[PDB]
C-alpha cells in the first residue's frame, strides 16, 4: 500500500512479469493466484567520482606591479612576466617633460597582476559500474533490495507471502562515456562531455591555470590605457547555459540520479496469505471512509469486530440493482488477522452507480459509490 | 606649456579666432601682436543627473517558509505573501492517507523566501541642457579655468598681466543623449541604448528596498526549495562588448570663438636682455615638429626680453619661427620656456647678444 497516493503509478497484469521502474513513479503488479505487490525505485546512487577538470568562474587581481620607460630607452621589464601566476599586458603612452621624461614621444609601459580564483567548477566522471539501485517491494496489507551491475539478480524474501527473484538490467542513464557530472557550489548537473571541454574559461587538471586570458578584460587598441582587470562572475552565465541540462541531487556523499531500471520478476515461489483461511462470519465496520485515488481506484480501511479470525474479508462490487458482480478488487484476497483488526482494500468500481458489500448476510455493510 | 607633450595637438593661426576643442586634444593659438595661448577641454560634467532604474545582478535567499494543504481544502496562506521583501510561488503535490490527508489528489502548496540584493547596477538619464564644459586656458611661460554651460555659453577670462579674452562656445554632439543611458556597474561605467537597458531581464527598482520581478533571479526548480540564479556580473560584461566605456567624462567636441581684442603681450613693455643665458633644460623635439627649451637668465637688468633667433647653416639669415610670443626673463636666475619651429635639416638657435650669446646646433630629421 505504498503506491496508492503516488501520482505517477502504472498497473501491470501478466499471465515472469515485465516491468519498468522509474524515479518519482511506482508499479503495482497483479496476477491470478499471486499477491498484489507495489514496486518502487527509491534511489540510483553513484559511490565514487573521478575529478577530470576544474574551471575558474570567479577571479581577482592582487600584487599589481608597473614598470615605465622613457622614449628611445627601450621596453621596460618585470620578473613577474616570467611568472605563470601573473597576467602581463604592454601599452605605449605619450611621454614628455610633464611626465618626467627628458625626451618626448611614445614611452613603453608594462603592468602585471597575480591571478587568483575565488569560484571554481568541477567536472567529474561517473563510472556506470559503481551504480547502486535501491528497489522497495511492498505487499498490500516494505522489503529493500539492491541492484548492482555486478549482482543484478536478487532474491527477495517476504514473510508469509513467499519469495521472488528480481532480475534487472542496469542500462539506464545516457552513455556516461559521453556524459560529465558538473558541480557548481551546491548544485550538480549531468552535461555532455564535449560541451564541458569546450567551455571558454581558465582550467586545471591538478595551482597553474591554463588560458587565464579567458577571464581577463578585452583590450581595444584605439582607446585610453586601463589597469589589468578581470571579468566579474560567470556563475549566472553558467546557470543560463544549463537551462536544458538535467539537474542531479547531491547530499552528504554520493550522487542521486533519475533512473529507468528495466526488471523481470519471478512470481513462481509467491503465495497469497489469506487463501489458507475461511470466510469471515462476523460484522465489519468502516475504520476509514472510502476515498477515490488519482488512478480511478478506491481505498477503504475495515475493522473486523466479529470472531473466528484469521479469516478472509468478503468484498464484492455489485451493480445499481445490487444483483451481479460488476467491479474488480485490486487487493489480493484481503484477510482479518485477529479481532478488532484493520484491513486496507484497493477496489476498482465501474463508472457511475455501484454498491460495495463488505460482510455476509444481514450484518453485511453496503456502501453506495459514484464514479465520475 | 600644456599641449607640448599631448599627442593630439592642433595649431591655429589668425589675426584677432575659430577653434574646435576635443577630449584628448589640445589647441595652440597664434596671432601677430597677441600672446601664444594653449586651450584644452578638461571635462564634460553633468551637475544634475536623474536615476531611471536600479537592477539587481547578485542576490541571496533566506528564511524559507512553506505551507501545505489537502486536496479540495483550498489554497494555503502565509503572512510572508503580504511582505514585499519576500518572493512567493504556488504549486500542487500528491496528497493522500499517508501524507495525513483524508482525500487523495493534488494539494496546493506555497513557498516564500527573503530576497536580498548584494550587487546592483544603476542607469542614469543624461540631459544635454545640464552639461558643464571645463576649459583650461594657459599662457606660454598653472592656467585659468573657465565654465561653458548651454545657458551661459559666453564667458570672460581674465589673465594676469596678459589682459582679457571672451570665450563664446556652442556645444556640438553627434550621438542622441535622449536615446542614451549612463550605466554604472561597481567601478566601470558605460553609455548604452535606453531601450536595451530597459529591456534587461533582471529584478529592478525606481530611485528597506522593494524589488520588482524577483523571479528573474529566483528559481523554484529542485532536482521543495528556493534557488538563487548567481552573479550576472560576467553575463553583463559579455553583453557590453560592443558598448562604449566611459570614465562624468562624456565625449563631444566643443566649438569655440575666442575674442583676442583685450589681449596684450607681457614682454613688449621690456627692453632686450644684455646678460648671459644658460640651458636649464636641454632642447628636445616634440611630436609636432617643434622644439622646446628652458633657459636660465644669469645676467642683470631683468625684467627683460629674451633674444632668440633661428639662423641657417651659415649662421647668417633668420630661417625658422618662434611659437612662444616675446619670451621674457622675470628676474635674475629666472627660468623661461620657449617653443621653436626650426626648419628641416641644419640650423643654429642663438640665445643672447654678442660673445655671451649661446649657440645651439639643431638637426631636424625630415
Amino acid at each position: 500500500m505504498r503506491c496508492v497516493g503516488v501520482g505517477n503509478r502504472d498497473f501491470v497484469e501478466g499471465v515472469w512479469v515485465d516491468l519498468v521502474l522509474e524515479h518519482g513513479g511506482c508499479v503495482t503488479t497483479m496476477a491470478q493466484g499471486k499477491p498484489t505487490l507495489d514496486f518502487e525505485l527509491t534511489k540510483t546512487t553513484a559511490k565514487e567520482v573521478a575529478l577530470l577538470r576544474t574551471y575558474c568562474i570567479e577571479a581577482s587581481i592582487s600584487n599589481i606591479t608597473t614598470a615605465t620607460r622613457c622614449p628611445t630607452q627601450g621596453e621596460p621589464y618585470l620578473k613577474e612576466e616570467q611568472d605563470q601566476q601573473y597576467i602581463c599586458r604592454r601599452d605605449v603612452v605619450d611621454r614628455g617633460w610633464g611626465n618626467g621624461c627628458g625626451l618626448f614621444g611614445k614611452g613603453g609601459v608594462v603592468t602585471c597582476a597575480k591571478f587568483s580564483c575565488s569560484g571554481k567548477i568541477t567536472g567529474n566522471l561517473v563510472q556506470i559500474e559503481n551504480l547502486e539501485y535501491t528497489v522497495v517491494v511492498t505487499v498490500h496489507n516494505g522489503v529493500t533490495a539492491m541492484i548492482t551491475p555486478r549482482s543484478p539478480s536478487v532474491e527477495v524474501k517476504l514473510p508469509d507471502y513467499g519469495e521472488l527473484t528480481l532480475d534487472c538490467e542496469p542500462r539506464s542513464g545516457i552513455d556516461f562515456n559521453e556524459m560529465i557530472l558538473m558541480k557548481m557550489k551546491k548544485k550538480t548537473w549531468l552535461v555532455h562531455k564535449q560541451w564541458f571541454l569546450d567551455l571558454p574559461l581558465p582550467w586545471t587538471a591538478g595551482v597553474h591555470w591554463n588560458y587565464k586570458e579567458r577571464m581577463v578584460t578585452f583590450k581595444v587598441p584605439h582607446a585610453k590605457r586601463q589597469d589589468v582587470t578581470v571579468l566579474g562572475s560567470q556563475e549566472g552565465a553558467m546557470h543560463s547555459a544549463l537551462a536544458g541540462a538535467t539537474e542531479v541531487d547531491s547530499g552528504d556523499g554520493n550522487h542521486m540520479f533519475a533512473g529507468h531500471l528495466k526488471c523481470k520478476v519471478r512470481m513462481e515461489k509467491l503465495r497469497i496469505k489469506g487463501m489458507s483461511y475461511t470466510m469471515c462470519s462476523g460484522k465489519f465496520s468502516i475504520d476509514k471512509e472510502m476515498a477515490e485515488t488519482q488512478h480511478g481506484t478506491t481505498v477503504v480501511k475495515v475493522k473486523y469486530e466479529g470472531a473466528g479470525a484469521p479469516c478472509k474479508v468478503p468484498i464484492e462490487i455489485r451493480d445499481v440493482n445490487k444483483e451481479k458482480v460488476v467491479g474488480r478488487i485490486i487487493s489480493s484476497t484481503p484477510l482479518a488477522e485477529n479481532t478488532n483488526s484493520v484491513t486496507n482494500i484497493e477496489l476498482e468500481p465501474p463508472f457511475g452507480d455501484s454498491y460495495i458489500v463488505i460482510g455476509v448476510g444481514n450484518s453485511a455493510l453496503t456502501l453506495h459509490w459514484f464514479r465520475k | 606649456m600644456r599641449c607640448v607633450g599631448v599627442g593630439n595637438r592642433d595649431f591655429v593661426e589668425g589675426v584677432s579666432v575659430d577653434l574646435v576643442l576635443e577630449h584628448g586634444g589640445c589647441v595652440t593659438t597664434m596671432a601677430q601682436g597677441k600672446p601664444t595661448l594653449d586651450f584644452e577641454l578638461t571635462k564634460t560634467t553633468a551637475k544634475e543627473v536623474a536615476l531611471l532604474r536600479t537592477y539587481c545582478i547578485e542576490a541571496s535567499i533566506s528564511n524559507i517558509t512553506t505551507a501545505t494543504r489537502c486536496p479540495t481544502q483550498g489554497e494555503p496562506y502565509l503572512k510572508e505573501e503580504q511582505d514585499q521583501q519576500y518572493i512567493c510561488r504556488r504549486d500542487v503535490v500528491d496528497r493522500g492517507w499517508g501524507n495525513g490527508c483524508g482525500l487523495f489528489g493534488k494539494g496546493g502548496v506555497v513557498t516564500c523566501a527573503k530576497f536580498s540584493c548584494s550587487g546592483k547596477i544603476t542607469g542614469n538619464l543624461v540631459q544635454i541642457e545640464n552639461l558643464e564644459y571645463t576649459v583650461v586656458v594657459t599662457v606660454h611661460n598653472h592656467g585659468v579655468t573657465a565654465m561653458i554651460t548651454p545657458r551661459s555659453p559666453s564667458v570672460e577670462v581674465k589673465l594676469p598681466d596678459y589682459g582679457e579674452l571672451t570665450l563664446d562656445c556652442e556645444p556640438r554632439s553627434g550621438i542622441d543623449f535622449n536615446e542614451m543611458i549612463l550605466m554604472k556597474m561597481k567601478k566601470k561605467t558605460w553609455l548604452v541604448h535606453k531601450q536595451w537597458f530597459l529591456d534587461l531581464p533582471l529584478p529592478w527598482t525606481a530611485g528597506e528596498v522593494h524589488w520588482n520581478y524577483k523571479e528573474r533571479m529566483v528559481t523554484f526548480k529542485v532536482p521543495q526549495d528556493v534557488t538563487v540564479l548567481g552573479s550576472q556580473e560576467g553575463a553583463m560584461h559579455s553583453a557590453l562588448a560592443g558598448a562604449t566605456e566611459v570614465d562624468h567624462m562624456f565625449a563631444g567636441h566643443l566649438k569655440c570663438k575666442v575674442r583676442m581684442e583685450k589681449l596684450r603681450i607681457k614682454g613688449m613693455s621690456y627692453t632686450m636682455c644684455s646678460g648671459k643665458f644658460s640651458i636649464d633644460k636641454e632642447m628636445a623635439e616634440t611630436q609636432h615638429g617643434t622644439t622646446v627649451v628652458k633657459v636660465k637668465y644669469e645676467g642683470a637688468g631683468a625684467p627683460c626680453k629674451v633674444p632668440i633667433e633661428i639662423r641657417d647653416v651659415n649662421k647668417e639669415k633668420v630661417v625658422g619661427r618662434i611659437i612662444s610670443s616675446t619670451p621674457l626673463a622675470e628676474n635674475t636666475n629666472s627660468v623661461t620656456n620657449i617653443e621653436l619651429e626650426p626648419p628641416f635639416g641644419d640650423s643654429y638657435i642663438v640665445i643672447g647678444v654678442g660673445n655671451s650669446a649661446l649657440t645651439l646646433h639643431w638637426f631636424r630629421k625630415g
Partner: antibody, heavy 126, light 111 residues
Framework: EVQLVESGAEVKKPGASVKVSCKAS????????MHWVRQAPGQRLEWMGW????????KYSQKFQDRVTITRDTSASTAYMELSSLRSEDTAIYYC?????????????????????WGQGTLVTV | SQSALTQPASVSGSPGQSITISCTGT?????????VSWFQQHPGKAPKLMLY???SRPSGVSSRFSGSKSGNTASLTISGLQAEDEADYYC??????????FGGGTKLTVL
C-alpha cells in the same frame, strides 16, 4: 529493541548555553528524524524543532529559531541540541522523539505515527 | 506560553465508566489534517503514543482508548476507567506550516 538514551541533568547560570544529547539504539539512525520537545515543571509540552539525521537539514519553532541549534553525529548515532543565552524560563525537561524520514532521505511530510519512541528527558535547572 | 490546541485542564471520572477529552484546534492543524495524535504522560515518566492518525493505535495500546474528529475538534475516549489511567493527556497535530503543536494538557483524576 528500540531505545533512546538521553544525557544527564545539568545546572547552568543565566546568560550561558547548554548542550543536551540523545543516543539512538536498535534502529538505523540516518533513516529517522530527531525531534526536540521541552516541558517546564507543571506546564505543557512544547515542540522546539527537528533534525533529519540523513542529510543534516533542520526546522525550528519561531520561539526557538534564534536560540536553538540542533546538530547530529552519524558515527556515534547521537543527536545534539544547543540552547544559547538561557534564562529562568528555560528551566525545563528536554525530551527527544523519533519519526521516520521518507525512503529518498527528505523530510517533507512525517509518518502518521510520529513520536512513537521518546527519550527519558534531561532536566535543565537555571 | 499559550498553545494553539485547547484542552480542558482537569477531567474527573469514576472507575469502570467512560470519559471523553476534547482537543480544539483550527483549519490549519486539527481541522485540516489527520496528523492528530494522543499522548499519555505519567508523573515523572516520558510521554507514550496512545493514538495516531486520529483513530489508529499502536500494538501495545488497549482497545479502551478510541479517537474521533469533527471539524477543528478532536476527541479521546477512555472506556472502563482504571486507577492506572490517572495520568496527563496531550493531543498533538502537524500544522499547515509544517510544525508540531501540543495541547495545554488534561490531568485525568480517577475516583
Amino acid at each position: 529493541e528500540v531505545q533512546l538514551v538521553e544525557s544527564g541533568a545539568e545546572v547552568k547560570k543565566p546568560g550561558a548555553s547548554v548542550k543536551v544529547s540523545c543516543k539512538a539504539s536498535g534502529y538505523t539512525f540516518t533513516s529517522y528524524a530527531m525531534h526536540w520537545v521541552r516541558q517546564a515543571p507543571g506546564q505543557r509540552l512544547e515542540w522546539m524543532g527537528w533534525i533529519n539525521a540523513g542529510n543534516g537539514n533542520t526546522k525550528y519553532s519561531q520561539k526557538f529559531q534564534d536560540r536553538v541549534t540542533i546538530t547530529r553525529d552519524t558515527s556515534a548515532s547521537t543527536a545534539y541540541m544547543e540552547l544559547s543565552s538561557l534564562r529562568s524560563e528555560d528551566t525545563a525537561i528536554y525530551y527527544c522523539a523519533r519519526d521516520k524520514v521518507d525512503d529518498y532521505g527528505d523530510y517533507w511530510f512525517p509518518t502518521l505515527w510520529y513520536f512513537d519512541y521518546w527519550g527519558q528527558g534531561t532536566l535543565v535547572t537555571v | 506560553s499559550q498553545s494553539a490546541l485547547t484542552q480542558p485542564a482537569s477531567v474527573s471520572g469514576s472507575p469502570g465508566q467512560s470519559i471523553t477529552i476534547s482537543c480544539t484546534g483550527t483549519s490549519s492543524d486539527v481541522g485540516g489534517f489527520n496528523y492528530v495524535s494522543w499522548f499519555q504522560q505519567h508523573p515523572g515518566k516520558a510521554p507514550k503514543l496512545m493514538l495516531y492518525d486520529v483513530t489508529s493505535r499502536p500494538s501495545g495500546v488497549s482497545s479502551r482508548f478510541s479517537g474521533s474528529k469533527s471539524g477543528n475538534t478532536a476527541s479521546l475516549t477512555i472506556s472502563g476507567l482504571q486507577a492506572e489511567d490517572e495520568a496527563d493527556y496531550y493531543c498533538s497535530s502537524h500544522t499547515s506550516r509544517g510544525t508540531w503543536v501540543f495541547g495545554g494538557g488534561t490531568k485525568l483524576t480517577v475516583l
